């Protein structure tokens, strides 16, 4: 009856809270929660469409509802296929992120920090603010300019791009800035 | 009855479409549409909460629903107050964007392109890709590295920060990169 409306209101409140906090803060766990919510978004839409269709007032409404449900389902299946292809290529669990199918590997201090990249571009910039590193708008922890990675890479289905550190500048002692430019590509 | 569910499904579909297109593409009109939808998000939550409260199954559900509605309402009112303060300071219609209360003025080729900034930071980076300029993740049209603005500014309620071009590098002929570092602050 009204339970659907209440849960929808709670969902919108949660989305607002994540939006107003995850935008300013890029904590890894908050980021993962936002990813999980974004993934959940699709089944919510499918459930809404099917529930509207089953209680269709007239034939046209049910038909359009089921058509939209099928559209969302095929979109979800295609995105799952691409995600599984990316996982097979990179064998990393980050490939199943609902954001996209491009991964950014950052060899930071012994480990490699893989993050979803929204677009593979010729230039990716790095900015260090108060000692905290952000590459492609992703908080990768504490780092300083002198030990910044000299090479990163971006992994996509049937492609692998390698970047190298361009010019690196130091701003106000602890803050800083840098860029990563493509110099190589590897298919398969 | 089920009209609310169908409109909610359509709203989620529209949000997905904007998310999957506005993320990769930063067209000004698409950006404005996304801003309008994000603004609409709040009244949708308020309507859902009030509709749940009026048809409360039990007293506790209605009480929590009205409490959440009041919380959302006071948040909306406070954000409106901050937005109006920013507009009074800057007298620009961009100050009413639902994203935040920080504006980025970019003096680009005679005009000034004001965009909502999600955080005022000591360093803001600029990247030119194939001749298209993005500052703080905002598409500001066609530009090249040599004529890049030598000074930008970030406007906030009771503060005004001025940046100046740091090091500027050219990548692969047409693409490029640059940074903007704070050198001054102006209160009031």
């Amino acid at each position, epitope marked *: 009856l009204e339970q659907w409306n209440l849960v929808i209101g709670f969902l919108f409140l949660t989305w607002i809270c994540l939006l107003q906090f995850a935008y300013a803060n890029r904590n890894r766990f908050l980021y993962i929660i936002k990813l999980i919510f974004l993934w959940l978004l699709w089944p919510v839409t499918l459930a809404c469409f099917v529930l509207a269709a089953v209680y269709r007032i007239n034939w046209i409404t049910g038909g359009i509802a089921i058509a939209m449900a099928c559209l969302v389902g095929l979109m979800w299946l295609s995105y799952f296929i691409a995600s599984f292809r990316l996982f097979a290529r990179t*064998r990393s669990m980050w490939s199943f992120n609902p954001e996209t199918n491009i991964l950014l590997n950052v*060899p930071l*201090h*012994g480990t*490699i920090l893989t993050r979803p990249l929204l677009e593979s571009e*010729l230039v990716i910039g790095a900015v260090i603010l108060r000692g905290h590193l952000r590459i492609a708008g992703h908080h990768l922890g504490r780092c300083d300019i002198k030990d910044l*990675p*000299k*090479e990163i*890479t971006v992994a996509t289905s049937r492609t692998l791009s*390698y970047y*190298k550190l*361009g*010019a690196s500048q130091r701003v106000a002692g602890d803050s800083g800035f840098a860029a990563y*430019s*493509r*110099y*190589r*590509i*590897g*298919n*398969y | 009855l089920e009209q609310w569910n169908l409109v909610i499904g359509f709203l989620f579909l529209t949000w997905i479409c904007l998310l999957q297109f506005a993320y990769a593409n930063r067209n000004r009109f698409l950006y404005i549409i996304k801003l309008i939808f994000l603004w609409l998000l709040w009244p949708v939550t308020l309507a859902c909460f009030v509709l749940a409260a009026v048809y409360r199954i039990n007293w506790i559900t209605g009480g929590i629903a009205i409490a959440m509605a009041c919380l959302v309402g006071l948040m909306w009112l406070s954000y409106f107050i901050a937005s109006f303060r920013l507009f009074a300071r800057t007298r620009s219609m961009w100050s009413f964007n639902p994203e935040t209360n920080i504006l980025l003025n970019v003096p680009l080729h005679g005009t000034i392109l004001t965009r909502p900034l999600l955080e005022s930071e000591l360093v803001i980076g600029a990247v030119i890709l*194939r001749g298209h300029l993005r500052i703080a993740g905002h598409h500001l049209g066609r530009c090249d590295i040599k004529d890049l603005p030598k000074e930008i500014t970030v406007a906030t309620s009771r503060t005004l920060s001025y940046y100046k071009l740091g090091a500027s590098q*050219r*990548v*692969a*002929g047409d*693409s490029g990169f640059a940074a903007y570092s704070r050198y001054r602050i102006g209160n009031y």
Partner: antibody
Amino acid sequence: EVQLQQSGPELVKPGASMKISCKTSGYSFTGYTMNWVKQSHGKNLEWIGLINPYNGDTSYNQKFKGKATLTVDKSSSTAYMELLSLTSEDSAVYYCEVINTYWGQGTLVTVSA
Amino acid sequence: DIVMTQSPASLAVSLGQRATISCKASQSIDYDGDNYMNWYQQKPGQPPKLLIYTTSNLESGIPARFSGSGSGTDFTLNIHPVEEGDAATYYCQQNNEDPYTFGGGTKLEIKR
């Protein structure tokens, strides 16, 4: 900066395998891919392949597939290249670069009996 | 496959002049509208030294007298002013398609 120290020259009989090490210093060994290059006759630079020393997946030239195998030892930061079934054609200098910027000094391989 | 064809096989220029090294690709090496073409320098008995990458990007620490140009199939390396320590061999490499191929190399001679 980064350093790449290889094994010295090695005289190898025909048809006998050998291993060319490339010890890395000045940077975390895992994080930069290691390319291998061959310069024959003193001027013909030929790409052999690259290895990601983190997960261990390589990518060879199809000419050197089955002739060269790329391995790593994260413990000692030492990358390896093993030449299989050496021939008079394989006499050359084998370099190891990382980001196309830092190279080794070259392992001169002489395949003669 | 790709075959980088350098030209000329040997060069001879006096000091203070400009030296131009060509490198033609059998096929266009464009990717996403960009050409990935490195230029190396190898003095005798020494490993190659990267000068340019992405066909126009000067490597960090290289004197700003090497310039990478060209696009499509025809690429070009320009040295000006040719100095006393530029006698070496210059190679063009495409970091675009497996296998990454080198050019035959052109020997830069200094006139005196």
